């Protein structure tokens, strides 16, 4: 048989590439608005939720957008002054002086600051993280709502989604689907309970890199949402403080009525039913032992409490009432409001979240749960699972676990007799390239780099084909005979009962071996023609 070059082959390899956000018609929609799906029969791929790259790109893209969106906003470096704070409870009435819009005049102002937002230096205080970070007020009239964000692959790449319902996150998938853009991924911020996520279709899904390793957070996806309604019941009045030419500093002031506590309600009915289901499921994935739950260990109020972000107000709700051992009721959780918060900890940056008049309410759907396992030689056959926080990428591993990014690779060199998107991935070689697959190779600075790179890969494949005498045609018979050492297989074995992927795995060792022969054969043919 003789070498034969096929262009537009449905095969791929794992790779790292720049994607781009799309969103739907704000911090995110400053992304270009759009989602086709096609099932891939007979295809099995080894997915990996943990060694993925879309989480490591989603993290950096959240950092980049949060830094970009907070550049034309106020900087509270003039506000780092001594604060005369008295009791108004966890709230302090703080009086201080400022350099007003007329610079040679000083004005005394008042503001209600929470005790978590100030540290002492008596009654003299300063705003927390002034002497380590540069606080930046979150801009009003620009909402920071987590709108759904799709991830569309660039030219020459594709995204495979695993449709197996019981898929835990690692290993083979029963049947997959190539898509352009992922589903709406709300970029939520949480610590111990994943909020507003995607529910599991049929069953509870538990995942870790290795359960016997204890430094590795265990993700648990609920197939049934648990309602959670939470609220800040204080009647705040927002006061504007002018500190410069167009810079305004919004503070709380003069709460009206009772100073009530922010609480976070969960229902004792659906909760502990879902938790008993989780307990039943975690019985099987270990040696038989009693499965039961403990509160969080010591740590930063950022990890010891279920934190999130509701309407720009940062809640820190204790979860000791959830993970401590059954009828209808309510599991009302105390919460602490924090204004100066530094999430995704950047040394030298903070964030003053401005206050809101009236009250707010926070209704969300718990669709997940992050856990960890205590170790030691504790015997007694009971495993103590505590909630775990920090390492923010986990919150986006729960939404990017079905997806995988693959690099499409043409030039599937196979032998034949002659000489001289991804719909057919699982199909055998016997019984379309130009119509469907090949046209999909061209159809800020990040998304410009990925498009220039798409152009380079299209030219670095088209030039190879042109140098192998294949300028205008997709299938070429070539003048290089098929060696016996290149895993010699019969035509029956190859073009029947064997898919393109297994063939790609078969002769991956002979890359840059047939290529040199093709170059020199084309050059020999042309130099014979000219002579």
């Amino acid at each position, epitope marked *: 048989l003789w070498v034969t070059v096929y262009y537009g082959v449905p095969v791929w390899r794992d790779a790292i590439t720049t994607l781009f956000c799309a969103s739907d018609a704000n911090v995110w929609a400053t992304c270009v608005p759009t989602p086709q799906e096609m099932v891939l029969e007979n295809v099995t791929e080894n997915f990996n939720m943990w060694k993925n790259n879309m989480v490591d790109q989603m993290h950096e893209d959240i950092i980049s957008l949060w830094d970009q969106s907070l550049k034309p906003c106020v900087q509270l470096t003039p506000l780092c002054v001594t604060l005369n704070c008295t009791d108004v409870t966890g709230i302090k009435n703080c009086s201080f002086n400022i350099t007003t819009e007329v610079r040679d005049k000083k004005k005394k102002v008042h503001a209600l600051f929470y005790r978590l937002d100030i540290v002492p230096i008596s009654t003299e205080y300063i705003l927390i993280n002034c002497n380590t970070s540069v606080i930046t007020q979150i801009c009003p009239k620009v909402s920071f709502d987590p709108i759904p964000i799709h991830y569309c692959a660039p030219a020459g790449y594709a995204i495979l989604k695993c449709n197996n319902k019981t898929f835990n996150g690692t290993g083979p998938c029963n049947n997959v689907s190539t898509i352009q853009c992922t589903h709406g991924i709300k970029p939520v911020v949480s610590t111990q309970l994943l909020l507003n996520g995607s529910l599991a279709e049929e069953d509870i899904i538990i995942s870790s890199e290795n359960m016997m390793d204890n430094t590795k957070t265990i993700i648990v996806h609920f197939n049934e949402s648990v309602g959670i309604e939470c609220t800040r019941p204080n009647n705040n009045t927002v006061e504007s403080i002018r500190i410069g030419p167009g810079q305004t500093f919004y503070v709380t002031g003069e709460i009206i009525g009772d100073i009530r506590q922010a609480h976070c309600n969960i229902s004792k009915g659906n909760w502990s039913k879902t938790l008993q289901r989780v307990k039943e499921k975690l019985k099987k994935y270990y040696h038989n032992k009693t499965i039961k739950f403990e509160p969080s260990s010591g740590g930063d109020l950022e990890i010891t409490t279920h934190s999130f972000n509701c309407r720009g107000e940062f809640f820190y709700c204790y979860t000791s009432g959830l993970f401590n051992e059954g009828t209808n009721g309510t599991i009302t959780l105390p919460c602490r409001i924090k204004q100066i918060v530094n999430m995704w900890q950047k040394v030298g940056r903070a964030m003053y979240a401005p206050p809101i008049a009236g009250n707010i309410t926070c209704s969300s759907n718990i669709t997940g749960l992050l856990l960890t396992r205590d170790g030691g030689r504790g015997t007694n056959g009971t495993e103590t699972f505590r909630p775990a926080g*920090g390492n923010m990428k986990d919150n986006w591993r729960s939404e990017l676990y079905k997806y995988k990014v693959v690099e499409i690779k043409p030039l599937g060199i196979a032998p034949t007799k002659c000489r001289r998107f991804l719909g057919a991935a699982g199909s055998t070689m016997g019984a379309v390239q130009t119509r469907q697959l090949l046209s999909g190779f061209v159809q800020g600075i990040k998304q410009l780099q990925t498009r220039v790179l798409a152009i380079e890969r299209y030219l670095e494949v088209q030039q190879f084909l042109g140098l192998w005498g294949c300028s205008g045609k997709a299938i070429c018979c070539t003048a290089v005979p098929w060696n016996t050492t290149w895993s010699n297989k019969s035509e029956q074995e190859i073009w029947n009962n064997m898919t393109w992927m297994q063939w790609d795995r078969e002769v991956g060792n002979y890359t840059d071996t047939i290529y040199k022969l093709l170059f020199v054969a084309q050059f020999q043919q042309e130099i014979n023609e000219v002579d």
Partner: antibody, heavy 119, light 102 residues
């Protein structure tokens, strides 16, 4: 990697010790600070690790409730406070940095500090 | 719960001999989950092999090891005078008792 630990002293029943593992010369934030208990002429034990960027800590089932592991990142010094010590707490105490610090992802404790032999 | 028994014996040997050390694991784990440690008399322990086959920096060539599943093994070809100290097999979290060489 420089780890400079503190000095030991016999603590009576009901006291509290605060041993330190002052680090220098590397990325302290992206580094676990596991603690290890050496029983006297006997096998070691795993007290607990402390992620220092968030304080997220996990102790052993044996010492769960009796110990607490604070960390300071400004001066890049991790802490370990042990209350309610008894006379059976005779041991040595070291701090090991590993768990993906080295090439392998599994717990591969390389650098160790100076020891602390609180009885 | 992962039980790491170690073989008995005190290995009454002289310099220039060899030494075979072994450690057992109670579950079918891969080779990456087990490591070996020198335990000196009163100084800081150091690591030789992590992953059951990958040597560490600043370590001579005389130490090798292999194993998969159960019955992991360490072998030293030439016992220098400093090598007559205790040796520990480390799991994820639970250390080993330590086989003895005199």
């Amino acid at each position: 990697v420089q780890l400079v630990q503190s000095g030991a002293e016999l603590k009576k029943p009901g006291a509290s010790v605060k041993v330190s593992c002052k680090a220098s010369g590397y990325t302290f934030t992206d580094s676990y600070m596991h603690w290890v208990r050496q029983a006297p002429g006997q096998g070691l034990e795993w007290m607990g690790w402390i992620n220092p960027n968030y304080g997220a800590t996990n102790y052993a089932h044996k010492f769960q409730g009796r110990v607490t592991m604070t960390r300071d990142t400004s001066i890049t010094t991790a802490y370990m406070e042990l209350n309610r010590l008894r006379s059976d707490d005779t041991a040595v105490y070291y701090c090991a940095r590993g768990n993906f610090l080295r090439v392998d992802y599994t717990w591969d404790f390389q650098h160790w500090g100076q020891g602390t032999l609180v009885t | 719960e992962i039980v790491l028994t170690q073989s008995p014996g005190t290995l009454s040997l002289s310099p220039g001999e060899g030494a075979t050390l072994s450690c057992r694991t109670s579950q079918s784990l891969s080779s990456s989950s087990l490591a070996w440690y020198q335990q000196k008399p009163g100084l800081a322990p150091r690591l030789l092999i992590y992953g059951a086959s990958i040597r560490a920096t600043g370590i001579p060539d005389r130490f090798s090891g292999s194993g998969s599943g159960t019955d992991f093994t360490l072998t030293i070809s030439r016992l220098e005078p400093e090598d007559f100290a205790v040796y520990y097999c480390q799991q994820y979290e639970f250390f080993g008792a330590g086989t003895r060489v005199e």
